[PDB]
Amino acid sequence: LLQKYVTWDDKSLFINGERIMIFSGEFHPFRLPVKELQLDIFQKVKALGFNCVSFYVDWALVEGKPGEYRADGIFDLEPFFDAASEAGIYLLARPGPYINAESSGGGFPGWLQRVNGTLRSSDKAYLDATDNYVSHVAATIAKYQITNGGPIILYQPENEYTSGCCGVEFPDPVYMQYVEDQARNAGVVIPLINNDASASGNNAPGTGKGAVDIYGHDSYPLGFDCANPTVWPSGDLPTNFRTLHLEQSPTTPYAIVQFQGGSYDPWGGPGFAACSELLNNEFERVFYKNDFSFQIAIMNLYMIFGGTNWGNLGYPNGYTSYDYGSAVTESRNITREKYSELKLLGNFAKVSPGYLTASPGNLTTSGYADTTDLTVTPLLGNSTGSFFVVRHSDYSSEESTSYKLRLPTSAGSVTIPQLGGTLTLNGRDSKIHVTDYNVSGTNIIYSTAEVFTWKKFADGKVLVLYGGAGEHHELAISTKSNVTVIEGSESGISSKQTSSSVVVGWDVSTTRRIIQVGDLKILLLDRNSAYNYWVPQLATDGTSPGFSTPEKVASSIIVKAGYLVRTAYLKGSGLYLTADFNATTSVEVIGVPSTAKNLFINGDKTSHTVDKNGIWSATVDYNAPDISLPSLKDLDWKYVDTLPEIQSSYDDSLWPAADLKQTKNTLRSLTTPTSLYSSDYGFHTGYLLYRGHFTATGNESTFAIDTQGGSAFGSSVWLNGTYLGSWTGLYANSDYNATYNLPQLQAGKTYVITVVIDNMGLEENWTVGEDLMKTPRGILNFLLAGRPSSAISWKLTGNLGGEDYEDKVRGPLNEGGLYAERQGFHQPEPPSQNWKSSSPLEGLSEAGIGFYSASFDLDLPKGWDVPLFLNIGNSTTPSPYRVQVYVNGYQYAKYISNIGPQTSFPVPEGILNYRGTNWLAVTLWALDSAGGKLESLELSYTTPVLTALGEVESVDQPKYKKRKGAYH
């Protein structure tokens, strides 16, 4: 339409005039702010057989001060795009402005709490607020479009523009047209795709003003209750998606822009381990092949890698981890069985062009399989091949089921197995059986076992098939050649020739068989062996794979290995592999180029042998080095009191006055004389402090206060030095009403009420018109008994400077309003010479907030990817306390002793300096009159990985420097 690089028809996208199935994974650059590790993820995604990544940009992190766009350093999108290009991964850009994403504000900066207009509407005050952000981020995206030689192929305007309320005329075509035009005016010419939250046809082609180019929708059919990870409720597997597609957008490729790849988890939830169990390998093979049954041509998994809600970037209901239960874990490992299962499907799609040109039919409980206990969805092609997606009719069934197939083929209709036996579907599994499947001119008439990959090499063709344990399978090939078993036993392998075919039966075994039919070799694997195979693209013109184009797909090799194979290239007489290892690994290479005489693994020449069938073999030894981690309790811990506000000498004369008589918040008008909403004064993040001055009559008895921080927030209150009490917090409370008893006061004396409030983040704004992102933080009501409300004059602070935030490197959300944070003491090399020697393990003996500093050295070996974790102990029921840990100035843990569940906090290399000095700053807030302390504080590691990753450069880590704007 505006360019010829990315086009489409009813069946699929075309990239440079060639059909491609887009298999994508969601990855948010702001949740892993280390550019070398961004390349790591992209390479792990490419190794799944995927060709695409989808990303959000978080407006709240890049325009913290209105009118100042800052996507630099750790927030630079450009190295992220270069990493995607280097890995050979196309991009779906989703800059918002609204993203939801379990992020603070759903992407919106807290200054949108002062916008006189409905958020996500055609109100001029909202639209004007978005212009600076979109014109920047969309210009940066424009520069990296595929039209300019970059990786970006699709653009999403808005996010799930689906639900409206409260006087908005939803859907507003003027609003969506405006959002689309902002992107176009910045230079975006690639297609626009939306992501309707349900299949509701919103903004579909043909709806006129506000219509996108390709209609997309989302689906989370298993929901977000990770507490019952084995429960698959009846009727939750979608069945009508293709029907809906043909009613809502028949002229565009069927697209699911967010399909479930995991789940979020709230404060106090079951943990992301439970989420990984619910959305495990069984979920993937059943639910993802089900999406294939609808002829999905654009499929994006939310999330593929989740990362970390570091520096308060997350929404209030979520905690620091955003592991998501996804295929790549928070610490970047690919140990989960769901990664390996996903790789099998991803590699199937990469090499099966007939999948896109076939004609999908409706699901059937008879006609294809000989029992109604199975359902079969046919995708019928003629010369280009057919596909048959098999599953249990009751999709949750764990039963083992025997069956036979009746499949049409170019050689006639056939009942399978022809040579005896039955097929088996064991429990929560699904299969894509194929007919007339093209392997570079050799026709596979049928195969019951599933295709992992195939390639044409100079010496012949190779096909890799797999089945689960206990399965009997069968295939037939259009040929007059006979079959020979060239590796493994002939036991269990049966065969027969007809006048123009050969038929082969086999039982799945843990030992590989290789059969040969003419110039076709066929690997017959069990699923668990297939998990260990990889299909890197073979570069001959450099070291980089390139994108998944037809030539570069065709020119790939097959590698059996272990943990990971990243890349492969041919240079002279050398075949080079880059790979990672977590155990001693037997490496095999199938389809070695005829010119190669030497094998290199991670730059090192490696002995190989060649077997009778031309397969190269080598061993890579794994010998983990000594990982020597310092004992965090034995460090030279220095303490400073980070609540000096409750000392009677404290002078708050430089604090901002909370003296606005009118709020600028349209959602909730004031119920106090002046606004005590933090965002009215530009404070949107971290701990908030309020100070209320009054002169006592002497007859004051109680002080009531409604505080609001979001779900699981807490607050504590003091009258001068006297602790009044705390709200210790519950996930179920986003606000709380407390009445505290005052001590006897002296008539005529001045007192100051100090209130500390945990801002858990700003709410999302999922429903258009509800304006829930405007939900204020701070003090909603107060009453000093027998005194008018105007008797208290309030001061407040959050992060120093508010929207004129101090730390341009670490961004606008990283630090809150504690004294120690305002002073910059959380950064490397604080002025702690003359501070007291005390540890968070000793802690506090009364209510309050302590600040702790220590350094430690790491000297971990080069060439190893070693995941490190901060651990906070909770082996027995604790007193209520709250902790933040800053690592070299970056907040990478937020902890609530009484709510949880996170005790283990991954911190990536780059934030940590693996061969240098590191700084921990810990805040301990005891919401208890007896005080509190840490049970234990420990640095740990998991399996070291012998890695191909280059050196991880440390991100910028500005050291402590005195701040003139501070209140001292």
Ligand X SMILES: *[C@@H]1O[C@H](CO)[C@@H](O[C@@H]2O[C@H](CO)[C@@H](O[C@@H]3O[C@H](CO)[C@@H](O)[C@H](O[C@H]4O[C@H](CO)[C@@H](O)[C@H](O)[C@@H]4O[C@H]4O[C@H](CO)[C@@H](O)[C@H](O)[C@@H]4O[C@H]4O[C@H](CO)[C@@H](O)[C@H](O)[C@@H]4O)[C@@H]3O)[C@H](O)[C@H]2NC(C)=O)[C@H](O)[C@H]1NC(C)=O
Ligand Y SMILES: OC[C@H]1O[C@@H](O[C@@H]2[C@@H](O)[C@@H](O)O[C@H](CO)[C@H]2O)[C@H](O)[C@@H](O)[C@H]1O
Ligand Z SMILES: *[C@@H]1O[C@H](CO)[C@@H](O[C@@H]2O[C@H](CO)[C@@H](O[C@@H]3O[C@H](CO)[C@@H](O)[C@H](O[C@H]4O[C@H](CO)[C@@H](O)[C@H](O)[C@@H]4O[C@H]4O[C@H](CO)[C@@H](O)[C@H](O)[C@@H]4O)[C@@H]3O)[C@H](O)[C@H]2NC(C)=O)[C@H](O)[C@H]1NC(C)=O
Ligand U SMILES: *[C@@H]1O[C@H](CO)[C@@H](O[C@@H]2O[C@H](CO)[C@@H](O[C@@H]3O[C@H](CO[C@H]4O[C@H](CO)[C@@H](O)[C@H](O[C@H]5O[C@H](CO)[C@@H](O)[C@H](O)[C@@H]5O)[C@@H]4O)[C@@H](O)[C@H](O[C@H]4O[C@H](CO)[C@@H](O)[C@H](O)[C@@H]4O[C@H]4O[C@H](CO)[C@@H](O)[C@H](O)[C@@H]4O[C@H]4O[C@H](CO)[C@@H](O)[C@H](O)[C@@H]4O)[C@@H]3O)[C@H](O)[C@H]2NC(C)=O)[C@H](O)[C@H]1NC(C)=O
Q: Which does 822 bind (CB under 5 to 8 A by kind): ligand NAG, ligand X, Cl ion, none?
A: Cl ion
* 474/463 Cα distance (integer angstroms): 14
Closest separation in Å from C-beta 269 to ligand Y: 13
Burial class (CB in 10 A: 0-12, 13-18, 19+), 537: buried
Binders of ligand U among 540-579, rule CB under 6 A?
562-563
Do the Cβ atoms of 174 and 195 come closer than 8 Å? no
Considering only 323, 471, 680, 803, the residue that binds ligand Z (CB under 6 A) is 323
706 contacts ligand Z (rule: CB under 6 A): no
Size of the site for ligand X (CB under 6 A): 16
**Binding partner of residue 867 among ligand Z, ligand Y, Cl ion, none, CB under 5 to 8 Å per kind?**
ligand Z
Residue from 943, 954, 963, 966 binding ligand U (CB under 6 A): 943
DSSP 3-state of 371: coil
733 makes contact with ligand NAG (CB under 6 A):
yes
Is residue 583 part of the contact set for ligand U (CB under 6 A)? yes
Judged on CB neighbours under 10 Å (0-12, 13-18, 19+), 857 is exposed
Q: Does 160 bind ligand Y (CB under 6 A)?
A: yes
Is residue 251 helix, strand or coil? coil
Q: How far is the CB of 967 from Cl ion (least distance, A)?
A: 4
Q: Residues 311, 75: contact at Cβ < 8 Å?
A: no
From CA 103, how far away is CA 763, in angstroms rounded? 8
Member of 413, 609, 648, 877 binding ligand NAG (CB under 6 A):
648
- Residues contacting ligand NAG: total by CB under 6 A: 27
Closest CB 685 distance from ligand Z, rounded Å: 25
Check residue 901 for interaction with ligand X (CB under 6 A).
yes
Q: Tell me how far apart the alpha carbons of residues 555 and 440 are, in angstroms, rounded to a whole number.
A: 12
Nearer residue to Cl ion within complex by CB, 350 or 822:
822
- φ and ψ at residue 80, rounded to 5 degrees: -60, -45
Using the rule CB under 6 A, is 458 a contact of ligand X? Answer: no
Map residues 493-532 to x or -, x wherever contact with ligand U holds by CB under 6 A. -----------------------------------x--xx
Between CA 406 and CA 415 the distance in angstroms is 4
**Residue number with CB closer to ligand NAG (598 or 746):** 746
Contact of 593 with 581, CB cutoff 8 Å? no
Structure tokens at 424: 């088996």
- Quote the least distance from Cβ 107 to ligand X, whole Å: 22
Bond preceding residue 378 cis, omega within 30 of 0: no
Pairing state between β 864-865 and 687-695: unpaired
Contact 298, 256 (CB under 8 A): yes
Question: What is the Cα 262 distance to its own chain's centre?
Answer: 9
Segment interacting with Cl ion (CB under 5 A) among 270-278, 285-293, 400-408, 959-967: 959-967
Q: How many chain residues are in contact with ligand Z, going by CB under 6 A?
A: 21
The verdict on 957 binding ligand NAG (CB under 6 A) reads no
* Closest approach of ligand Z to the CB of residue 307, in Å: 10
Query: Which CA distances in Å does 905 have to 54, 626, 796, 871, 891?
Result: 25, 22, 31, 6, 11
Quick one: which of 234, 254, 233 has its CA closest to 243?
254
Q: Which residue has its beta carbon closest to ligand U?
A: 280
Could you list the beta-strand ranges (E) of 728-847: 735-741, 750-758, 778-784, 793-797, 836-837
Decide whether 116 or 543 has the Cβ nearer to ligand NAG: 116
Q: Which of residues 901-940 bind ligand Z (CB under 6 A)?
A: 903-904, 906, 936, 938, 940
Provide the 3-class DSSP secondary structure of residue 117. coil
Tell whether residue 822 is a contact of Cl ion (CB under 5 A). yes
Could you tell me how many residues of this chain bind ligand Y (CB under 6 A)?
Answer: 11
Which residues from 439-468 bind ligand U, rule CB under 6 A? 468
* Burial of residue 386, with CB atoms counted within 10 A of its CB: 0-12 exposed, 13-18 middle, 19 or more buried: buried
Quick one: 229 or 269, whose CB is closer to ligand X? 269
For position 320 contacting ligand X by CB under 6 A, the verdict is no
Residue 670: count of CB within 10 angstroms of its CB: 18
Count the Cβ atoms, other than its own, within 10 Å of residue 266: 19
Give least dist CB 151 to ligand Y, A: 22
Of 95, 360, 769, 867, the residue at the interface with ligand Z (CB under 6 A) is 867
CA 277 to chain CA centroid, nearest Å: 16
How many residues of this chain bind ligand U (CB under 6 A)?
17
* Interaction of residue 273 with ligand Z, rule CB under 6 A: yes
CB closer to ligand X, 853 vs 897 = 897
Name residues contacting ligand NAG, limited to 93-122 (CB under 6 A). 116
Strands 604-606 and 598-601: antiparallel
Other beta carbons within 10 Å of 809: 18
340 makes contact with ligand Z (CB under 6 A): no
Quote the least distance from Cβ 482 to ligand NAG, whole Å.
4
The C-alpha angle with vertex 136 and arms to 135 and 137, in degrees rounded to 5, equals 105
Interaction partner, residue 706 (ligand U, ligand NAG, ligand Z, none; CB < 5-8 Å by kind):
ligand NAG
Token digits for 163?
A: 């639900």
Rg of the Cα trace of the chain?
A: 30
Q: Which of 331, 529, 923, 947 binds ligand Z (CB under 6 A)?
A: 331
Q: One symbol per residue from 773 to 812: x for binding Cl ion (CB under 5 A), - otherwise; what is it?
A: ----------------------------------------
Structure tokens at 503: 């038929």
Look up residue 742 and give its amino acid: L
Distance of closest approach, residue 335 Cβ to ligand Z, in angstroms: 5
Asked if 966 touches Cl ion (CB under 5 A), the answer is yes
* Sequence-ordered alpha helix ranges (H) in 795-836: 819-822
Q: Minimum Å distance from CB 822 to Cl ion?
A: 4
Round to whole Å and give the CA distance between 926 and 64. 30
**Token reading at 834:** 């003359």
SS3 of residue 693 by DSSP: strand
702: phi then psi, degrees, rounded to nearest 5: -130, 165
Question: Does residue 382 interact with ligand NAG by CB under 6 A?
Answer: no
Token readout for 453 is: 């990959």
Region of 347 (left: φ > 0; alpha: ψ -120 to 50; beta: rest) is alpha
Q: Is 749 in the site for ligand NAG (CB under 6 A)?
A: yes
One character per residue 256-275, x = contact with ligand Y (rule: CB under 6 A): --x-----x-----------
Selected from 268, 468, 830, 908, the binder of ligand X by CB under 6 A is 268
Residue 703 beta carbon to ligand Y: minimum distance, rounded to whole angstroms: 38
Residue 337 contact, options ligand X, ligand Y, ligand U, none, Cβ 5-8 Å cut-off depending on partner type: ligand U
Tell me: does residue 967 bind Cl ion (CB under 5 A).
yes
CA distances to 60, 198, 202, 312, 468 from 56, rounded to whole Å, are: 12, 19, 21, 17, 37
Interacting residues with ligand NAG between 433 and 452 (CB under 6 A): 438, 440-441
Q: Which of 120, 277, 80, 26 is nearest to 772 (CA)?
A: 120
Q: Is 943 in the site for ligand Z (CB under 6 A)?
A: yes
Could you tell me if 264 and 101 are in contact, meaning their C-beta atoms sit under 8 angstroms apart? no
State the binding string over 869-898 for ligand X (x if CB under 6 A, else -): -----x--xx------------------xx
Q: What are the residues binding ligand U (CB under 6 A)?
A: 276-277, 280-282, 335, 337, 340, 468, 528, 531-532, 562-563, 582-583, 943
| Footprint of ligand Y (CB under 6 A) | 100-102, 159-160, 197, 218, 220, 258, 264, 766
Q: By CB under 6 A, name the binding residues for ligand NAG.
A: 116, 383-384, 438, 440-441, 482-483, 495, 648, 650, 663-664, 666, 699, 706, 720, 733, 735-737, 749-752, 781, 786
Residues that bind ligand X (CB under 6 A): 266-269, 730-732, 874, 877-878, 897-901, 903
